[PDB]
Amino acid sequence: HMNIEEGLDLSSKTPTALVQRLVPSVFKEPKNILYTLDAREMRDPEHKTEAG
Amino acid sequence: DSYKTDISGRLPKGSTESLTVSGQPEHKVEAKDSNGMPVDNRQGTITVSASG
Amino acid sequence: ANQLAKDLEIMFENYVEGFEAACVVSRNAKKFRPGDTAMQRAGDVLYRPQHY
State the virtual CA torsion across B2, B8, B9, B11 in degrees, nearest 10. Answer: 80
In angstroms, rounded to a whole number, what is the distance separating the alpha carbons of residues B29 and B42?
A: 9
- Asked if residue B22 lies in contact with residue B48, where contact means CB atoms within 8 angstroms, the answer is yes
- Experimentally, how was this structure solved? cryo-EM
By C-alpha distance, which of A31, A48, A26 is closest to A39?
Answer: A48
Residue at C17: amino acid letter: E
In angstroms, rounded to a whole number, what is the distance separating the alpha carbons of residues C4 and B29?
A: 11
User: For B23, which DSSP code?
Assistant: S
Distance from CA of C6 to the nearest CA of A (A): 10
Say yes or no for a CB contact (<8 Å) between A24 and B38. Answer: yes
In angstroms, rounded to a whole number, what is the distance separating the alpha carbons of residues C52 and C49?
A: 9
Q: Which residues of A touch C2 (CB under 8 A)?
A: 17-20
In angstroms, rounded to a whole number, what is the distance separating the alpha carbons of residues B13 and A48?
A: 45
- Asked if residue B30 lies in contact with residue B41, where contact means CB atoms within 8 angstroms, the answer is yes
- The DSSP H or E segment spanning B22 is strand B21-22
In angstroms, rounded to a whole number, what is the distance separating the alpha carbons of residues B44 and C34?
A: 72
Resolution, given in Å to one decimal, reads 2.8
